[PDB]
Design a protein around this ligand. Structure first.
Ligand SMILES: [Zn+2]
Lengths: 155, 195, 56, 54, 48, 162, 43, 326
C-alpha cells in the first residue's frame, strides 16, 4: 500500500564515534566483504543469499554512537544508540530471535537442550499460532464448505 | 563356464543393501541369479566370495554414502545373517507369491458360497509356497473381517511378520511388520472345485 | 522340500525404533476433533467465544 | 436442482445452505440463491412403487 | 520371547460411519476426496 | 519373436525390423495386484489403487487440470512416463477401411495397482496437507479413468491406501 | 455372513492349536536341569 | 570516547522528556461501555487531516460533518510533531454516533522504512524478491520498539526485550536482514578480539536475566490474583494419560492436589495422600515422591525467582505461618 510509507527519508547522522582507533581503510572492505551475504531459511533449506544496498563501514554502522532517523516528535532528534549491553536482552535475543522451523525446535525440546531459556517461549507462541490457524480454519467451516486449492491458481 | 552352460545362480557377498528379492544386505552370502548378480559385481553392491571377504567386508552406510562400514562376519554375525535371512525369506516369498484358488460359486453376487477362513489361507500358504506360519497373524481387510473373504477375483490380506526388530530390518522391506498375501479365487465347477 | 518359516524371536515383536511412519497424514484426533474423542463435561475445551468466555 | 450423483458429494456452498430430509432424500435447501445452490441426493422418487422403480 | 497375535492383529468388524451431515464442520472434514469414485465403470481393463 | 530390442521400454520393436512389435491384447495384463510399492520422492503422488488401461491423452488432460489447481512458484508437478505403452485397434480386418496406420497410433498404458502417476514435488520449504493435496488432485482424478488415491511422501504404506 | 452363525472361535481362529506357545515352554524346561534327585523322585 | 551511560541495560524506555508527551496524545479516552458501531482506522499526517474521501467520506456515509473532527484532531496533533509523521487514528463510533479516537505512533512498517532509508517498493521478502534489502542491527530495532507500545497507558509492559522480537520478525518478513543474527559474524568492532567480544557478552547476556526476571517477577506480583494461582504443567503426562485423564476429570483433580506447592491449606497429609492413593490405582505416577513432582508440575510461566519461592520445601517452613489472617 502507498499510504503508511515514509516520504522523507532522513539520513544516518553519526553523532559520536564508537572508537578512538580509526578503522583503517584496508580492513573496512575486508570485513564488509563478509557481510554482503546473509543466510536465509533455517534448516537443511539453508540458503546463503545476497543482500542489496550494503552499507560501507560497519565498525561505525550501528554498534554505538550513530543516530537512527525515526525522528518523530518536535524535540526528539534522531536518537543516539547506546552501547550493546545498555539495551536489555540483546545478546539474549541473538539466541532467540530468528526464523525458527519447528522441525529445528522440537528436537531441542524433546532433548531439553535449549540454547536459550526463551526458546521455550518462542516455541509456544509459534504453536499457539498454528493452532489458531486451525481454530479459525474450522470456526469458518461451521458457516459453509471451504475447500483448499479447489479454485484456479495462477494465470 | 561354457557360453552355453552358465551358472543359473552364483554366490555373492553383498556390500550394499538391496531391497529386492534377489537383493541381500550387508555382508551375507547369497546365491542370487547370474544375470542380476553380474550387474552387481560391476555395480559394486556385491563381490564374489574370495577367501578374504569371508571374514570382513566393507559394507555401505547411507549416512556418508561410501563403503566405509566394516562388517566383520564372525560366527556371531553368521547367526545374525541367518535369522535375518530366514526372516526376509518368508517376506519375499509371500510378497512375491500370488496364491490361487478354485472354488464353487452359484448365485449372482459373485460370492464364494463357502467363504474363506484364516485357516484356508495358511493352508494355501503351506500348500503352494510351503510358508509355514501361525494363522493367528493373518489379519483380514475390513470388508472381509465379518464374513471371511467370500468374493471371487483378487483378494488380499495382511500377514504379520512379528519378530523383526532385533534383526535391524527396515527400509530394506516394504513394511517391517506386515506383508500383503494376494489371494485370487478362480471359480470352478464341481469337477475341479472342493468344499 | 524347502519350507520357509519365521525365525524364533529374540526381541520385541512389534518394532519400536524400526516402525515405519503410520502412512496416513497424522492430523491427530485432537487437532481436528473429527470423532472418537471423549471429554469430561466439566473439562470442555475451547469455547473462547461461546462458553469459555464466562468460564463457570 | 442438480442431483449430486452420490449423497457424499453434497457440499454447503452458502451460509444459508443447510441439509433437509425431503422425503427420505437428504438434500440441500437454501433460502438465498434458491435453486442456484440447491442440491438433491440421488434416490428414488418420493412416491415410487415396487414394480416401477424397484 | 513371546508374540501374541492379539495385540497388533485386530480383526474388528467396524461400522463404516456415515459422513455426519447433522453437523456442518464434521461434514466438511469427513469429505474424503475420493467421492470421485464415479470412475468405477468396470471399464475395459485390457483394451481401449 | 516377442519383447526384445526395446525402444527404451516404451514399446518393444521387432528385432529384425524397426516396426513396432504388435503384441497380444492381454499382454502385460494389469490384472495383477502389484506387490512392489512405489517409493515416491515428491511431496505427494497420485498412485493408482486399481488397475486399468489409461491413454496418454487421458493422462495429459489430467496434467493440464492438475497444473491449474497448483501454486506455481512453489510446487512443480512431476509426471512419470517410464512405464510401457501398448497398442490399440491393430489388426487388419479389425481396422476401419484398411487404415491400420491410423488406429494403432494411439498408445495406452496398462497400469497395475499402486503405480504412481504424478508428483506435487517441492521447490522450497513450503509444505502441503492431505487436504491441500487431495484438493489439487480432485481435478485430475476426474479424468484418469481408473480409481486413484493420493499418497504422501516416501514409501506408500499400502496397508492404509487400500 | 459367518461369525453370526458360528462363533468368534470361527473365522478369527488360528486352527493351529498345536504349538504357538508350548514349544517355547519346551525350551524353558530344557534350560533348568535334571539330576539325581530329579530322578530319585522318579525313583 | 563518550559512552552516555554504562549500565547493563538501563536504556529500556524513552527519555522522560519525550516520554512525558509520549502519552499526552497516545491516550485512550476510556470506553464508555457503549456498543461500538464502527472501528475505523486511518493513516493521517501530522496535522494535515482533511474533510475529503479519506476521512470526511466515512463520516458522510453516516451524515457526520467530519469538518469538525479534523479540527479536534488538529487540536491535539498539529504541535508536538516532526513534519510529515503519518499517525494512525483509531476512530470508534458508538450507537449514539459519538466517536472516540486514539491517535497512535506511526506503523512500525513506516518506522522500518525510515530507519533503513528505502521507499515504497524497494523492500520485500526474499521469497518474493530474491534479495535481502537494507541491513539493520538489533541496536536499531530496540529504538523502533520504544515508540511502539501496545498499552500507551502502560508503556512498560509487554517488556522491550519481548516486543523487539516482534519488530525483528516484522522486519525479516520484509527482507530486513539485521546483522546480529542472519549472518555468520556479528557487527565487527575495533575494540577487542571476537573472544574478548564474546567473553564480554557471556557476562552481559546473563546479567540481563536477573534484570529481566526481576522485571518479569515484579510484574507478576501485581498481576490479578488469579494469575498467580496454581496451573500444573502438562509436559510430564504422556498422551495416553493425557487422554485417559480427560475422560474422567477425577484424575486431573487428584493430580492437582497431588502436585501442588505447599501452602497453609495444603499441608493436610490425608488430603495430599488421598490423591496419591487414587493415582496408584490408575497406574499413574508411582515412582515420583512428592518433591520431584512439584519441580516438574509447576506453572512453567512463573519467573524463575518465584518459580522457586513456591517450591517445596522453600515454602514448607513459613508454610503454616501465612494464613488468611482474619
Ligand atoms: Zn448457497
Amino acid at each position: 500500500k502507498r499510504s503508511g510509507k515514509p516520504s522523507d527519508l532522513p539520513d544516518y547522522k553519526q553523532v559520536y564515534l564508537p572508537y578512538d582507533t580509526a578503522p583503517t581503510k584496508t580492513e573496512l572492505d575486508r570485513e564488509r566483504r563478509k557481510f554482503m551475504h546473509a543466510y536465509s531459511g533455517r534448516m537443511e533449506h539453508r540458503k546463503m543469499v545476497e543482500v542489496k544496498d550494503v552499507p560501507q563501514n560497519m565498525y561505525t554502522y550501528g554498534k554505538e554512537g550513530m543516530s537512527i532517523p525515526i525522528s518523530i516528535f518536535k524535540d526528539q532528534a534522531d536518537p543516539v544508540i547506546g552501547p550493546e549491553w545498555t539495551y536489555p536482552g540483546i545478546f539474549e535475543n541473538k539466541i532467540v530471535a530468528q526464523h525458527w522451523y519447528m522441525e529445528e525446535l522440537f528436537d531441542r525440546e524433546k532433548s531439553n537442550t535449549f540454547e536459550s531459556p526463551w526458546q521455550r517461549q518462542v516455541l509456544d507462541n509459534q504453536v499457539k499460532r498454528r493452532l489458531g490457524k486451525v481454530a479459525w480454519r474450522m470456526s469458518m467451516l461451521n458457516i459453509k464448505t471451504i475447500d483448499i486449492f479447489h479454485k484456479e491458481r495462477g494465470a | 563356464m561354457a557360453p552355453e552352460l552358465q551358472l543359473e545362480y552364483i554366490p555373492i557377498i553383498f556390500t550394499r543393501t538391496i531391497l529386492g528379492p534377489q537383493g541381500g544386505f550387508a555382508g551375507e552370502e547369497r546365491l542370487i541369479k547370474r544375470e542380476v548378480a553380474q550387474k552387481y559385481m560391476s555395480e559394486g553392491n556385491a563381490v564374489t566370495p574370495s577367501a578374504e571377504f569371508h571374514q570382513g567386508v566393507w559394507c555401505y552406510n547411507p549416512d556418508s554414502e561410501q563403503y566405509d562400514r566394516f562388517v566383520e562376519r564372525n560366527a556371531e554375525f553368521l547367526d545374525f545373517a541367518a535369522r535375518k535371512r530366514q526372516w526376509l525369506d518368508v517376506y519375499w516369498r509371500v510378497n512375491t507369491g500370488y496364491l490361487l484358488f478354485g472354488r464353487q460359486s452359484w448365485g449372482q453376487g459373485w460370492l464364494l458360497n463357502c467363504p474363506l477362513r484364516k485357516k484356508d489361507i495358511a493352508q494355501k500358504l503351506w500348500e503352494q509356497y510351503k510358508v509355514r506360519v501361525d494363522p493367528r497373524l493373518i489379519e483380514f481387510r475390513e470388508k472381509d473381517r465379518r464374513t471371511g473373504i467370500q468374493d471371487l477375483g483378487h483378494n488380499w490380506c495382511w500377514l504379520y511378520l512379528p519378530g523383526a526388530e532385533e534383526l535391524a530390518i527396515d527400509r530394506e522391506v516394504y513394511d517391517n511388520k506386515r506383508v500383503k498375501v494376494r489371494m485370487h479365487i478362480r471359480k470352478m465347477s464341481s469337477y475341479g472345485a472342493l468344499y | 522340500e524347502r519350507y520357509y518359516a519365521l525365525p524364533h524371536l529374540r526381541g520385541p515383536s512389534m518394532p519400536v525404533q524400526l516402525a515405519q511412519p503410520s502412512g496416513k497424514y497424522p492430523s491427530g484426533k485432537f487437532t481436528q476433533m473429527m470423532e472418537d474423542v471423549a471429554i469430561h463435561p466439566l473439562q470442555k475445551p475451547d469455547a473462547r467465544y461461546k462458553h469459555n468466555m464466562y468460564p463457570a | 436442482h442438480p442431483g449430486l450423483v452420490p449423497r457424499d458429494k453434497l457440499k454447503l456452498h452458502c451460509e444459508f445452505c443447510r441439509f433437509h430430509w425431503v422425503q427420505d432424500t437428504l438434500v440441500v435447501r437454501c433460502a438465498a440463491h434458491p435453486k442456484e445452490h440447491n442440491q438433491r441426493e440421488i434416490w428414488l422418487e418420493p412416491t415410487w412403487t415396487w414394480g416401477k422403480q424397484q | 520371547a513371546t508374540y501374541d497375535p492379539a495385540a497388533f492383529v485386530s480383526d474388528d468388524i467396524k461400522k463404516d460411519v456415515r459422513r455426519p451431515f447433522w453437523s456442518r464442520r464434521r461434514w466438511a472434514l469427513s469429505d474424503n476426496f475420493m467421492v470421485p469414485m464415479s470412475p468405477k465403470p468396470k471399464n475395459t481393463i485390457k483394451d481401449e | 519373436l516377442r519383447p526384445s530390442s526395446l525402444l527404451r521400454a516404451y514399446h518393444y520393436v521387432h528385432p529384425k525390423t524397426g516396426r513396432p512389435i504388435r503384441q497380444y491384447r492381454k499382454y502385460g495384463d494389469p490384472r495383477f495386484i502389484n506387490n512392489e510399492v512405489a517409493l515416491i520422492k515428491g511431496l505427494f503422488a497420485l498412485i493408482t489403487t486399481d488397475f486399468g488401461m489409461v491413454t496418454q491423452s487421458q493422462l495429459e488432460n489430467a496434467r493440464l487440470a492438475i497444473l491449474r489447481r497448483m501454486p506455481r512458484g512453489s510446487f512443480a508437478l512431476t509426471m512419470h512416463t517410464d512405464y510401457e505403452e501398448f497398442p490399440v485397434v491393430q489388426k487388419s480386418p479389425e481396422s476401419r477401411m484398411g487404415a491400420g496406420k491410423s488406429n494403432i497410433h494411439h498408445f495406452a498404458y496398462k497400469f497395475t495397482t499402486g503405480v504412481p502417476l504424478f508428483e506435487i514435488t517441492a521447490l522450497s520449504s513450503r509444505r502441503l496437507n492431505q487436504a491441500e493435496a487431495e484438493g489439487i488432485f480432485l481435478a485430475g482424478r476426474s479424468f484418469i479413468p481408473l480409481q486413484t488415491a493420493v499418497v504422501p511422501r516416501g514409501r506408500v504404506d499400502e496397508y492404509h491406501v487400500f | 455372513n459367518l461369525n453370526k452363525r458360528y462363533g468368534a472361535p470361527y473365522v478369527a481362529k488360528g486352527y493351529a492349536s498345536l504349538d504357538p506357545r508350548c514349544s517355547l515352554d519346551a525350551y524353558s524346561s530344557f534350560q533348568q536341569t535334571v539330576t539325581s534327585a530329579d530322578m530319585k523322585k522318579a525313583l | 570516547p563518550k559512552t552516555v551511560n554504562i549500565e547493563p541495560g538501563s536504556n529500556r524506555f524513552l527519555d522522560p522528556n519525550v516520554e512525558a508527551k509520549a502519552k499526552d496524545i497516545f491516550a485512550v479516552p476510556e470506553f464508555p461501555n457503549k456498543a461500538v458501531l464502527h472501528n475505523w482506522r486511518f493513516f493521517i499526517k501530522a496535522g494535515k487531516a482533511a474533510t475529503g474521501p479519506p476521512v470526511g467520506q466515512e463520516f458522510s456515509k453516516l451524515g457526520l460533518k467530519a469538518m469538525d473532527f479534523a479540527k479536534a484532531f488538529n487540536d491535539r496533533t498539529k504541535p508536538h510533531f516532526k513534519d510529515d509523521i503519518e499517525l494512525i487514528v483509531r476512530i470508534q463510533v458508538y450507537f449514539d454516533k459519538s466517536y472516540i479516537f486514539r491517535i497512535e505512533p506511526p506503523p512500525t512498517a513506516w518506522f522500518l522504512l525510515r530507519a533503513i532509508r528505502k521507499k515504497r517498493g524497494e523492500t520485500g521478502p526474499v521469497v518474493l524478491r530474491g534479495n535481502y534489502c537494507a541491513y539493520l542491527t538489533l541496536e536499531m530495532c530496540y529504538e523502533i520498539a520504544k515508540m511502539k507500545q501496545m498499552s500507551w497507558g502502560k508503556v512498560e509492559y509487554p517488556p522491550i526485550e519481548v516486543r523487539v522480537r516482534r519488530v525483528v520478525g516484522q522486519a525479516r518478513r520484509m527482507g530486513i536482514a539485521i546483522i546480529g543474527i542472519d549472518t555468520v559474524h556479528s557487527s565487527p568492532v575495533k575494540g577487542m578480539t571476537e573472544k574478548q567480544y564474546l567473553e564480554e557478552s557471556e557476562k552481559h547476556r546473563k546479567v540481563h536475566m536477573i534484570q529481566y526476571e526481576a522485571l518479569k517477577a515484579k510484574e507478576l506480583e501485581s498481576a490479578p490474583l488469579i494469575e498467580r494461582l496454581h496451573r500444573p504443567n502438562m509436559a510430564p503426562l504422556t498422551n495416553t494419560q493425557l487422554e485417559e485423564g480427560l475422560k474422567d476429570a477425577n484424575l486431573l483433580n487428584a493430580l492437582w492436589k497431588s502436585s501442588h506447592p505447599k501452602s497453609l491449606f495444603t499441608q493436610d497429609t490425608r488430603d495430599r495422600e488421598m490423591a496419591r492413593r487414587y493415582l496408584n490405582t490408575r497406574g499413574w505416577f508411582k515412582e515420583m515422591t512428592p518433591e520431584e513432582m512439584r519441580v516438574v508440575f509447576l506453572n512453567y510461566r512463573l519467573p524463575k525467582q518465584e518459580d522457586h519461592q513456591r517450591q517445596l520445601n522453600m515454602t514448607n517452613g513459613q508454610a503454616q505461618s501465612q494464613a488468611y489472617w482474619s
